[PDB]
Design a protein around this ligand. Structure first.
Ligand SMILES: [Ca+2]
Ligand SMILES: [Ca+2]
Length: 701
């Protein structure tokens, strides 16, 4: 289907102006004018063509080759001319199993017909003549190295279309711009033409004629745009200027803490005294100078989980000489653009700044599934991974000493640092048109070059989670990288993150670019500042099409509605933003509130505080504990219910006098208290909170 001979069809007589590059499954090398919609009528006249590939025969025999136009043809079989601007009967000997290179050149001045009707035939010894069947034809070896059986360059004999990097796309097309269009069986690669392609909404591709993969990744520019690629590669990374590579972190979903058995305690029949909590994990980004790492930070829920207000040590019966154990459920998360097949990266679980508690490893070459971009391992429809799995006897206990345990109780934070060891790559094979894991290809041989030759943009517009993409961008200091096309900031956002521009305004899923801020590392900042100066531009948002990206830039783009911590996780929002987001109330009663709150807003809240204010201005706080703010819940209808009864002993609010007020406040994550105060107070006193509802008793009704 993606197999056959590779054809270059030129409008000129001398192989200089390629109009179509495409493959044919069989010896029928025709392109009917019917298929030439994406090309100017006057360019539909092909005056020359070149085909290349291999022939593989199923049965040894003497064959004669012929075409539809032997008078206008020269054909080579492994360096040997077999057709020379004349028909013949010259039999060449071909043995089973062996691969023979084919090159065919065709020239015809002033054809009176558009397109090309051209067929390649052969006749065996039993005088059967037919168009060469698909099972006999293979593509050229369009790789950076030759195969054991398939040479990567064609014979030096005759015409060679300029293709300096051997990806299959002619030099001139990569530099000047090309488009890819799908017919029924085939993809046509053609020159970009403004008045034809711009309105069809087609993508204008440019790539380096000297880089087989312009993003320095393991898939060629041609493989990408023709679909000759792992189907798990992200759609945006089918662009030659967008890097395809995995990006993995670990998501911890929950945790259970328990007291370690010790030799001194013979009795193992005591009551369960474990501490189980939900956890929230986010991939982070620090802008630590020059970082290329995977890390996520885990927040352990501080809300009420057990009776009493005991310390963790009291709860678990942990004395100063005891040790504790941690178990947890996790999944791996691929937020990058290429899949992983046979090695999951190794992860350190870290307490505080640098106390490693555990090393989390999966079994090499024994993965239960692929870990695909925009997906999880295990998939979300399957159980997560327990750090100590019930099956294996050999899972190492994740242990903490007493002082570390107290530290975890106080910080309620863990960090997961994951390496970039991703194993082997599934590559396309031109011999059989299949994609398979290549044991000779490893991500560790690719990632450094990707990181060195691309600009990185990290964007949080999808659910406020950080997503990293890398886009091919010139390095003015590296001659090879100057052969890449100019990459603008605007173009990068379109191709890497799917920004569009319906009315001259760049948007991401309906949000104008101006709704996001720009943040740069030191070197990138100075670079962009210089560019703006050179442009006499005072506002980056009005010149995004004129700002050029360079290799090694780091750009961080964030939703402006939110406040961010040092890990660039969203942790709060302006009082005015939070207020407005709670303005539309659906229903109110002494039982609670029913609102429609933006999904992003909910992400930055830790909970709510409910208060009744009497006529003299005194306030009764109903859920007056730092661990009792979790009173909101998302309903199946998407609406949020704030539950007044939960921490009111299951009772609706009692409002003594209709003139009393019910006030509800939102508490953002950055303002959230996660421990009792120093003086031991567990109340909400002093919590910085945002009034989001205030009605008198007669208004609630
Ligand atoms: Ca090329
Ligand atoms: Ca290229």
């Amino acid at each position: 289907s993606s197999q056959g001979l590779l054809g270059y069809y030129f409008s000129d007589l001398n192989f200089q102006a390629p109009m179509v590059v495409t493959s044919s499954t069989t010896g029928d090398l025709s392109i009917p004018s019917s298929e030439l919609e994406n090309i100017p009528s006057e360019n539909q006249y092909f005056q020359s063509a070149i085909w290349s590939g291999f022939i593989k025969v199923k049965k040894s025999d003497e064959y004669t080759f012929a075409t539809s136009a032997d008078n206008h043809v020269t054909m080579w079989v492994d360096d040997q001319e077999v057709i020379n601007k004349a028909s013949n009967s010259n039999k060449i000997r071909l043995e089973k199993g062996r691969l023979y290179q084919i090159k065919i050149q065709y020239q015809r001045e002033n054809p009176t017909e558009k397109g090309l009707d051209f067929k390649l035939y052969w006749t065996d010894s039993q005088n059967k003549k037919e168009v060469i069947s698909s099972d006999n034809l293979q593509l050229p070896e369009l790789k950076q190295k030759s195969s054991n059986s398939r040479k990567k360059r064609s014979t030096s004999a005759g015409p060679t279309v300029p293709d300096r990097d051997n990806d299959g796309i002619p030099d001139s097309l990569e530099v000047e711009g090309y488009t890819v269009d799908v017919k029924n069986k085939r993809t046509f690669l053609s020159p970009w033409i403004s008045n034809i392609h711009e309105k069809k909404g087609l993508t204008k591709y440019k790539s380096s004629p000297e880089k087989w993969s312009t993003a320095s990744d393991p898939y060629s520019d041609f493989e990408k745009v023709t679909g000759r690629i792992d189907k798990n590669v992200s759609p945006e990374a089918r662009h030659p200027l967008v890097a395809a590579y995995p990006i993995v972190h670990v998501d911890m979903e929950n945790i259970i803490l328990s007291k370690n058995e010790d030799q001194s305690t013979q009795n193992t029949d005591s009551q369960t005294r474990t501490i189980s909590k939900n956890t929230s994990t986010s991939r982070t980004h620090t802008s630590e100078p020059g970082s290329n790492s995977n890390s996520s930070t885990v927040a352990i829920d501080h809300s009420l989980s057990l009776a009493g207000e005991r310390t963790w040590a009291e709860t678990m019966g942990l004395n100063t000489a005891d040790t504790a154990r941690l178990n947890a459920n996790i999944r791996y998360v691929n937020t990058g653009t290429a899949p992983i097949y046979n090695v999951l990266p190794t992860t350190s679980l870290v307490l505080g700044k640098n106390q490693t508690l555990a090393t989390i490893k999966a079994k090499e070459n024994q993965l239960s599934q692929i870990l695909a971009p925009n997906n999880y391992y295990p998939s979300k429809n399957l159980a997560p991974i327990a750090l100590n799995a019930q099956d294996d006897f050999s899972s190492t206990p994740i242990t903490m000493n007493y002082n570390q345990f107290l530290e975890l109780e106080k910080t309620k934070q863990l960090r997961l640092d994951t390496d970039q060891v991703y194993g082997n790559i599934a590559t396309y094979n031109f011999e059989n048109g299949r994609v398979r894991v290549d044991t000779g290809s490893n991500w560790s041989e690719v990632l450094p070059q990707i990181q060195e030759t691309t600009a990185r943009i990290i964007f949080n517009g999808k659910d406020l989670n950080l997503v990293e993409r890398r886009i091919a961008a010139v390095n003015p200091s590296d001659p090879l990288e100057t052969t890449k096309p100019d990459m603008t900031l605007k173009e990068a956002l379109k191709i890497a993150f799917g920004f569009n521009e319906p009315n001259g305004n760049l948007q991401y899923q309906g949000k104008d670019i101006t709704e996001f801020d720009f943040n740069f590392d030191q070197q990138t900042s100075q670079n962009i500042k210089n560019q703006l100066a050179e442009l006499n531009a005072t506002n980056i948002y009005t010149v995004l099409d004129k700002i050029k990206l360079n290799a090694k830039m780091n750009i961080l783009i964030r939703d402006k509605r939110f406040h961010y911590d040092r890990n660039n996780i969203a942790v709060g929002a302006d009082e005015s933003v939070v207020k407005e987001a709670h303005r539309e109330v659906i229903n109110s009663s002494t039982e609670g509130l029913l609102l429609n709150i933006d999904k992003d807003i909910r992400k930055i809240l830790s909970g709510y505080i409910v208060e009744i204010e009497d006529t003299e201005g005194l306030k009764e706080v109903i859920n007056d504990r730092y661990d009792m703010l979790n009173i909101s819940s998302l309903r199946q209808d998407g609406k949020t219910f704030i539950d007044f009864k939960k921490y009111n002993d299951k009772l609706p609010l009692y409002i003594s006098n209709p003139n009393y007020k019910v006030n509800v406040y939102a508490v953002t994550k950055e303002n959230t208290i996660i421990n009792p105060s120093e003086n031991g107070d567990t109340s909400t006193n002093g919590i910085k909170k945002i009034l989001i509802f205030s009605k008198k008793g007669y208004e609630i009704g």
